[PDB]
Structure formats: structure tokens, C-alpha cells
Amino acid sequence: ISPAQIAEALQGRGWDAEIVTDASMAGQLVDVRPEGILKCVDGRGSDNTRMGGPKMPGGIYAIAHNRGVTSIEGLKQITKEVASKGHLPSVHGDHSSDMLGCGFFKLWVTGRFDDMGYPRPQFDADQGANAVKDAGGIIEMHHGSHTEKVVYINLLANKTLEPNENDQRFIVDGWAADKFGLDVPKFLIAAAATVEMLGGPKNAKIVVP
């Protein structure tokens, strides 16, 4: 899917979308490092000490969700898969709602994706976090409130953007979906629906090389 197709798809859902250059993001783009956790698009600050990893909704839950994987065994398999592909796998909570502090997972476990054709997870938030931890993953915990003002959809392979708790943004590394063989259009639409259902801003900037 091309940057223009992504913008068109988002505009079809009532979003404002614009394509921007990698040069316009100078000073913010960073190379992905193997030590970084593949983590959520959440714009808040957190206890993360493993920066420089890719961003996907709910961390590795985006992969399970896109593939319709709902079992604890399947979640552990994905944890090890991510660890085998150059990133430390993670899921997260926050210090306001504990493991229900991940908006994406809360939407999934409460059935908000039902009519988009997604099956529900066969575990709750605490069980999922414990399984990821048991399989070698990291549990991140955010703090503060959501104040995201924009959604960046980064298409530059092996690069990412980092959270700024003081001028927040949702960050989606679209290129990472391709890396994991996901149904990409489905992944991006799920990301869009997530932001919509969380009341976030339907305003996207698509970063291209």
C-alpha cells in the first residue's frame, strides 16, 4: 500500500491526512536498535529504559490481533518471534489502570473490534502481561494522561520516532507491519479505528523516504 493509498483510506474514514518528508522530521527520526522494545503507539512518558524500538498498537498485541491469535500459547509464540527478529517484545499498562492502561488492549478485550471481524483474546490483561513476561518479554508502564495531538505513520524502514510526553503524538511504524508479514491495510485500518475509539485525533502525517 502506497502513502497516497494510506491517506485516501484515512480520509475515507473522516481523517485529515498529509504526506510529509523524512527531511521534515530531521532531529526526531532515530535508528531502531536491537535493545529497544517493540512497544505501543501511546504518546505518554513511561518507565521505558529500552528506547529505539518500533511502535505498533498495544506493542506485540498488534501482531496477535492482526493474525487473529487469541491464545496464551499463541501470544508466547509471538513474543519469541519478535525477540528473534531484532526487537525486545513488550506489552504495557500504566499507573492509573494497571494492565488495562493500554487503550488498544482494553478495546480488544472489551469487544470493540467485534464487527471489524476480530476474535476476542482468550485471556485478560494481567494474564497476557504475565505470559509475555514468562516468554522473555518486557512489561512497560506509562504514567500521566493522554494528550496526543497528531498521529505519525512512519514508513521509513528501521527508523522510528520517540514519545514526547510534553507534546504528545501517536506513532505507528507502518514498515514494521510489513516486517512481520501482517495484512498491512488491515493493520493500518485497525490502528485508525483504535485512535478513533479512544477519542484521539483523526489527524495523520505519513512520513516517507
CB-CB contact of 194 with 148 (8 Å): no
**194 grid coordinates:** 483504535
CA angle at residue 200 from 181 to 175, to 5 degrees?
Answer: 20
The DSSP 8-state label assigned to residue 98 in this structure reads: B
Binding-site members are 40, 92, 102
Contact 142, 101 (CB under 8 A): yes
Known binding residues for Zn(2+) are 40, 92, 102
Quickly tell me which residue has 511504524 as its cell: 173
Nearest residue to 116 via CA among 196, 41, 45: 196
